[PDB]
Scaffold this active site. Structure first.
Site, mmCIF file in Angstrom:
data_model
loop_
_atom_site.group_PDB
_atom_site.id
_atom_site.type_symbol
_atom_site.label_atom_id
_atom_site.label_comp_id
_atom_site.label_asym_id
_atom_site.label_seq_id
_atom_site.Cartn_x
_atom_site.Cartn_y
_atom_site.Cartn_z
ATOM 1 N N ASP A 155 -0.274 -7.526 1.900
ATOM 2 C CA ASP A 155 0.130 -6.343 2.053
ATOM 3 C C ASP A 155 1.462 -6.094 2.236
ATOM 4 O O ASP A 155 2.344 -6.006 3.212
ATOM 5 C CB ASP A 155 -0.621 -5.387 2.835
ATOM 6 C CG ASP A 155 -0.220 -3.855 2.895
ATOM 7 O OD1 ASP A 155 0.521 -3.678 1.681
ATOM 8 O OD2 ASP A 155 -0.396 -3.112 3.921
ATOM 9 N N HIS A 215 0.740 -1.141 -0.070
ATOM 10 C CA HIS A 215 0.030 -0.010 0.101
ATOM 11 C C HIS A 215 0.740 1.299 0.031
ATOM 12 O O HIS A 215 0.438 2.313 -0.518
ATOM 13 C CB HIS A 215 -1.132 0.191 1.119
ATOM 14 C CG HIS A 215 -0.522 0.478 2.530
ATOM 15 N ND1 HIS A 215 -0.032 -0.306 3.527
ATOM 16 C CD2 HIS A 215 -0.482 1.931 3.010
ATOM 17 C CE1 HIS A 215 0.533 0.324 4.404
ATOM 18 N NE2 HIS A 215 0.395 1.678 4.440
ATOM 19 N N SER A 250 4.060 3.330 7.770
ATOM 20 C CA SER A 250 3.651 2.364 6.771
ATOM 21 C C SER A 250 4.831 1.931 6.198
ATOM 22 O O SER A 250 5.636 2.365 5.545
ATOM 23 C CB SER A 250 2.969 3.151 5.583
ATOM 24 O OG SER A 250 1.362 3.397 6.073
#
Ligand code: NA
Length: 321
Positions: free
Chosen positions: A167, A118, A268
């Site tokens: 992910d 992502h 992230s």
């Protein structure tokens, strides 16, 4: 009529040295391969090769292929919501990834970066090389080691904007990073690394993401957080606005019931690391993936990609490219 094996092949991050004589490559001649040993270790051979009757340099095991110099991994000077400031050498695999919104990764070997799909999906599919920076604690510093992506591999089971299952992504760098005390890769989890990743086992998240102030950090931060029971974590996301089955078997959760310690927006792609207390090396068990919109929210644990599930995928891509 004696055969000539010629000059030895190049050993990346290593060197060839002649044992029999300087530049002698005839039948029965011996050479020794070695690695830059401070930061690399030789694998699969002791590096002793001899000229065989078939014109080939061959190891003590009779292999026609070269030995491998592999960067030492998982070293730390240790030995984000509610955390504290990292020191130089604490997280030497920590990588900053620009181009989209603030994101991170972790160095593997001396030429790969493990991150979240992502975090890099938009940039990869806009055919834009990623601006990758390491060796720096300060996000906005002009002083860092520059790397550039050559290729980005997004797990083919990942579906952008439709949950975070699968992910995970790999970035191949276009050049080898120079490995030093401030820049060394994280270790990939071995078979039994799950023994250090049980409920209540402690992992570490690091990054430049949001703190309790609600702003990104200028300096690299970290927190130690416990692995949370999977059913408990599943139930915590079994409510609007989360779609059914948001927490999958390809995820682990970590955090407190109180919300006091967490990874946030901007974290992230970061590696959630754990310490193998027997090898004394750190390894990556998770990737900062998702959680509730508000950081450090009570009862809403951080959700991380379960890296050990993807070892075959990782080894497939790294070995093939
Ligand atoms: Na949250």
């Amino acid at each position: 009529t004696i055969v000539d094996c010629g000059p030895p092949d190049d050993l990346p991050s290593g060197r060839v040295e002649y044992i029999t004589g300087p530049g002698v490559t005839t039948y029965k001649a011996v050479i020794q391969y070695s690695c830059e040993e401070t930061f690399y270790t030789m694998k699969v051979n002791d590096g002793k090769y001899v000229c065989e009757a078939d014109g080939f340099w061959t190891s003590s095991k009779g292999e026609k292929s070269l030995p491998v110099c592999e960067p030492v991994c998982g070293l730390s000077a240790r030995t984000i919501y509610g955390g504290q400031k990292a020191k130089p050498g604490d997280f030497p695999w920590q990588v900053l990834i620009l181009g989209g919104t603030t994101a991170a990764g972790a160095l593997l070997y001396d030429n790969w970066v493990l991150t979240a799909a992502h975090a890099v999906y938009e940039q990869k599919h806009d055919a834009s090389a990623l601006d990758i920076r390491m060796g720096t604690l300060k996000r906005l510093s002009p002083h860092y080691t520059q790397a550039w992506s050559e290729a980005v591999f997004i797990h083919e089971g990942y579906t952008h904007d439709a949950g975070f299952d699968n992910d995970i992504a790999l970035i191949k760098l276009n050049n080898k990073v120079v490995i030093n005390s401030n820049i060394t890769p994280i270790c990939l989890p071995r078979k039994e690394a799950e023994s250090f990743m049980r409920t209540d086992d402690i992992g570490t998240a690091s990054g430049w993401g949001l703190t309790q102030r609600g702003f990104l950090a200028r300096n690299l931060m970290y927190v130690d957080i416990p692995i949370v029971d999977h059913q408990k974590c599943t139930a915590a996301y079994e409510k609007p606005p989360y779609p059914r089955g948001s927490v999958t078997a390809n995820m682990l959760c970590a955090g407190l019931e109180s919300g006091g310690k967490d990874s946030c927006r901007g974290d992230s792609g970061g590696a959630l690391v754990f310490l193998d207390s027997e090898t004394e090396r750190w390894f990556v068990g998770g990737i900062v993936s998702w959680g509730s919109m508000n950081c450090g929210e009570a009862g809403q644990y951080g959700v991380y990609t379960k890296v050990i599930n993807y070892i075959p995928w990782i080894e497939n891509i790294i070995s093939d490219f």
